[PDB]
Amino acid sequence: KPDEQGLQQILQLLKESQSPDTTIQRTVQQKLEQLNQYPDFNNYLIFVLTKLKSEDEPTRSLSGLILKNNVKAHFQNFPNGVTDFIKSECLNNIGDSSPLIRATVGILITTIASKGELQNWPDLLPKLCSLLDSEDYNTCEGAFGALQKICEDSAEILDSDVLDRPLNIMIPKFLQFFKHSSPKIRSHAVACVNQFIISRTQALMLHIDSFIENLFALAGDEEPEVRKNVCRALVMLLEVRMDRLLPHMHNIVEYMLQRTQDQDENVALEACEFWLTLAEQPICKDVLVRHLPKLIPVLVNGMKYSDIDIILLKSDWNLRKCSAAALDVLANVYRDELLPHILPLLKELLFHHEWVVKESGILVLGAIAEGCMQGMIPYLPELIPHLIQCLSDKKALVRSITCWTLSRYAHWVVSQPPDTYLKPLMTELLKRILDSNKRVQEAACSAFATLEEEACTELVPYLAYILDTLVFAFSKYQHKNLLILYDAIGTLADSVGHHLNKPEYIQMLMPPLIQKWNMLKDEDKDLFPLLECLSSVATALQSGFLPYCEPVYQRCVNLVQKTLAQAMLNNAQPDQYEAPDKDFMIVALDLLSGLAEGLGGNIEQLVARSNILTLMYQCMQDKMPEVRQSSFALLGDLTKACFQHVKPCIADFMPILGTNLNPEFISVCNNATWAIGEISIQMGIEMQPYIPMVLHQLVEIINRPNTPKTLLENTAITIGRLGYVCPQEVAPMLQQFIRPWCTSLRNIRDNEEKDSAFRGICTMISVNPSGVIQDFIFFCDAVASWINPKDDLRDMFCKILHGFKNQVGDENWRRFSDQFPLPLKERLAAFYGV
C-alpha cells in the first residue's frame, strides 16, 4: 500500500493530536473529523499503528484508537479490501511486544467483530482458536482476550446457527486451557466458558463433567481473578444444573463459606452470591445443615459498610447488599426457625456503642423482618420504641437504616393501638423527612410512604400535620428526593381519599405541584412520579380539582398523541427515527383516567373538544399490555363520565375488548371486563348484537383456576350487568357459572356494583329458573351477604326465594334449610322470611 508524502501529513497530524493546548487539538479535531470519511486515511491509520515501528507507542496506539472510532461511526461505509487490510494487519499483530499496542489491536479487532459483524468476518473465530495454540505467549493472551470480549459481547449470536456452530469447537478448546501455566490465561478460559452456562449451550452441557472437574482442580488457585471466576462458575452452575453439583455439594458449600470470608472482597462478593442463588432452590434446608450456624454470622458480618464506603459517605451491588439480600431470602426459607441464630447476633449488634455495628444490626432487623415476622412479634414491644429512639441518632446512616427497618415493621405497628406506636413513629418520621441530610430525607420519605400505604384513614386525624411537613419539603428538596416526595403525596391521596379535599389543603398543596409541572419538559422522565402523583390527587380531590384540570388534560392528550406519532415514525424509518418510550403514554392515560374518575361528568366539556377517543382506539391495539390496560381503564372511566362521546365508538371498540380478555395478562383482562360492564349499563338493550364475542370467554374466565380475586369479582359483576341489559342471551346460561359468581360476589361490600350485578342475576333468573335449581344454596348464601339491599332488590330476592320454597314443597324446603349455617338461616327469615 502507498506511503511517503501523505505519510508525513498523518504523522504531523497525529503529532498535533497530542498537544498541551486546547487550540491546536481543536484545530486537529476538525482536521480529523473532515478526514475521517476517507478510506485511504484509515489505511494510513492501521499502517501507522501496526507497520510503523519508527514511531512511539503512544502515537501508534492513538492512530489505532482514532481508526477504532472511525469503525465505531460509519464502518459500514468504507469499502472492503481496505477493511480487509485492517483485519489482516490486526490479526497478524495480535500478539505484540508492547502491552499498549496489544491493547489497541485488541479493541480494534473487538470493535470490528461487534460492529461490522460476526458473520461478516467469517474466518475470525477459527483464526483466534488457531492462535490459542501459539508458542508465543503474547499471541495466546491477545487471542484469548479478544475471544473473551467477543463471548461477553455476543453469547446469543454464538449459540445460534447463523455462525454455523463455533461454540462446538471453542468450548472444548477453552477447557483445555484451564490447565495453563499463566493465571491470565486460565482466567480468560473460565471467563469465556462462563458466558455459556445459563444458556445451557449444548457444547458446555455435553462437556459438563470435564468442566466441573477442571473447576475443582482450580479451586485453590492463589490468583483472585481465577478464584472469582470459579465462584461465578459455581453460582451459575448451581442455578442451571443442580444434578451434577449434588454429589459434591457439602465440599462446595464448605468452599464457598470460605470464599465468602475471603480477603479480596471481589472473590467474597462472587462467593456470597452463591447463598442468594442457593436460597432459591427447594433443597436448600437439607444442604445448609451443619454449615448454617457459621453461614449466618458470616453474612451478618459482611453486612456492615466496608471502610471505603464509610469514608465516602459521612450506589452499586457490593458485599453488604449481597449479604443482606441473602439473609432476607434465607429468613424467608427458614422463617421462625432462623431466630435462635439471629437473636444472639442482634443482642450484641443492636445496642452497640460503635455505630457501624449498631447500623449493621438494624439492617439485620429489617432484612429478617419479612420471613421472621411471626417469631419476632414477642420482641417488638421492646424493639420498636428503641428504633423510634434511633431515628434521633446523631449519626445519619443510623437514622436512614432505622427509617427503613421501622418501615418493614409498619404493619405490626398499625395493627397495635395508635397512641403507643403509630403516633410516635409518625411524629418522628415527619421530623426526619426534614432532616438536614439527603440520604435521611429519602429514607424517611420512603418509609413514611410505606407507612401511609399500611395505615390508611388512620392517617386522617393527623392529615394537617402531615401536609404541614410534606409541603415544606417542597422548599428543602433537591429534586432527587422531590420524586420520592411526589410518591409520598400520591400515596397520601390514595390513603386518605376524599378527606383530602378542603380549600386550605388544596391552596397549600397545588401551587408547588403546578410549579414543578410548568417547569418540566414533555421529554423528561421525571414527569412519571409527578403525573402519577397528580393522578391520585385528582381522584382524591374530585370536584375540587376543577381549576387545575384544563392544562393537565391538554398536556396528557398531547403526550399520548406525540408518543403515538413517534411510534409510527419509528416504525416507518427505524434507522432515522428513534422509538418513543411508551411510558409517557401510559402515565398520561393514567392521569386522564384519574380525571375521568372524580371529575366525572365535568370532563365532558373537555372530551367533547378532544381526539382522545381517536387515540385510545390506537392505544387498545398497542402490542404493549400496560398501554392496553391504561387504555381500557380510561375507556371505563369515560364510559361512566360522559357516554355520548363513547357510543359512536362501541362498534369498533367491542371486538377489541373481545380479543383482549386473555387472562394471561391479568390487568388487561380485568380492565377490559370492567370496561365491558360499564358499557352495558349505558347501552341498555342495544348491547344485544354483541354479547357473543365476550360471553363464552367471560364464563371460561370466572370458572378458571387459579384466578386472582379482583379479576373474578369484576368478571361476575360484568356478567351480571350483561344479564341485566340482555337476559335473553346471557341468562340462558347458568351453572356454567353462578357457583363461582356467588362465591365471589358474596365477599364484596354492598354498593352500586353487585347491586347492578344482583339485579342482573335476578332478571336472569326469571328467564332461566331451571339453571339455578341445581345449586340454589350458592344463591341463598349470596343473597345473605347483603346487610342493606335497596328495597327493590330486596323484593326481588323475596319473590325468588319464596318462588323456590313453594316450588320445591315445604318441609323438604326445611330439609334443604337444615344445612343452612345459623346466621344465614336467620337472616333469610329476618329480611325475607324465607
Binding site: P529, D590, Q629, F632, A633, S667, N670, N714
Partner: peptide, 19 residues
C-alpha cells in the same frame, strides 16, 4: 372490583432500600 392501577407498584419500585 374496579380498574387495576399498577401505580402504587411503580411508587414502590422507586422507593429507597438498603439492598
Amino acid at each position: 372490583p374496579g380498574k387495576m392501577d399498577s401505580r402504587g407498584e411503580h411508587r414502590q419500585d422507586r422507593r429507597e432500600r438498603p439492598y
